[PDB]
């Protein structure tokens, strides 16, 4: 069975998508000026030692100058635990269950708009519009303004290979307005914590949460549909047994990891897998490669939606593991379950092929033209 990567030419430089094993699991990369970690055990070691492998990437900026406080992804212990503890109750299974009906209603509304189409782009119809609502609800952003965020996000991703300033100014005004009558929501918790967090900290957290929760989820949705198109026997079984959807989404994350790598900075000289890293060097931890390591996964080149256990690193591991995982799992499940209900047949179009997000550290669909019948 031809993989999505082979069929569509996904990230030829991500050699693990093509079954090739690294020469060694830790290796220095000249173009990025960074150490790459490709192995599962080595990724676990790096992720589990934040004292040596810092997430505060500003430490690598050259002599000179830088304000990332409030961004949990950039924050090391001891502040990391304190900031995460302040916000973590916004991400629980109880919150997931409270938001699920809203996500289901929005999914059905989005599908009504395309249900009669002969062809449509899954990404524009469903995968891009859906994931803003969760982040907007967490941040108490008015329903009126959520469209702004979809536009700004996709625009900024386009520029990278105006919208960011407008988004940040909205976020600063939103922080200032939320101080007027704070409520028992996440914005209020950020405001009330006690030094205290300033609007700069709150804007950093809000920008982080949009980066973290939007396009990742979009890619998960698109990637999973792409996998169903390439593995149609598995897709038929999913359609007939929707309890397979969660394991399908986990295998999609293992096989096409939306976050292909994260970043660390060494704080000291350190040896990993026989390699001598120096202090003040960048380390890229390639979740996508670790997710193909045959020391951990049997037949890692095969897409198997019933793989279980499936301890993939698509949501990370250790202190920074994805706080949004339960929300993302729900969004993917709701999107896929209703898509399959509304379209008894879906196919890619060899004349309008899928395209992929450009970032070298991502693995995901950016456009997915589909046909709703053959003919
Ligand atoms: C399938 C979709 C998603 C993927 C693949 C994903 C991937 C990741 C990964 C790999 C990390 C760890 C990064 C690191 O350790 O350096 C992470 C962290 C994070 N993600 Fe996600 N994520 C997803 C969905 C979400 C959603 C929906 C939210 C918001 C609810 C979110 C918010 C975050 C936050 C806040 C962090 C930082 C956690 C911390 O610093 O402790 N993510 N994500
Ligand atoms: Mg350093």
TrEMBL record:
The keyword Metal-binding applies. Keywords: Heme, Iron, Metal-binding, Monooxygenase, Oxidoreductase. Heme b binds at residues 80, 84, 262, 264, 320, 322. GO terms for molecular function: heme binding; iron ion binding; monooxygenase activity; oxidoreductase activity, acting on paired donors, with incorporation or reduction of molecular oxygen. PROSITE patterns: CYTOCHROME_P450. Mg(2+) 2 binds at residues 266, 280. Mg(2+) 1 binds at residues 58, 68. It comes from the Bacteria. The keyword Magnesium does not apply. InterPro entries: Cyt_P450, Cyt_P450_B, Cyt_P450_CS, Cyt_P450_sf. Belongs to the cytochrome P450 family. PANTHER family: CYTOCHROME P450 YJIB-RELATED, P450, PUTATIVE (EUROFUNG)-RELATED. This is Cytochrome P450 107B1 (P450CVIIB1). It comes from Streptomyces himastatinicus ATCC 53653.
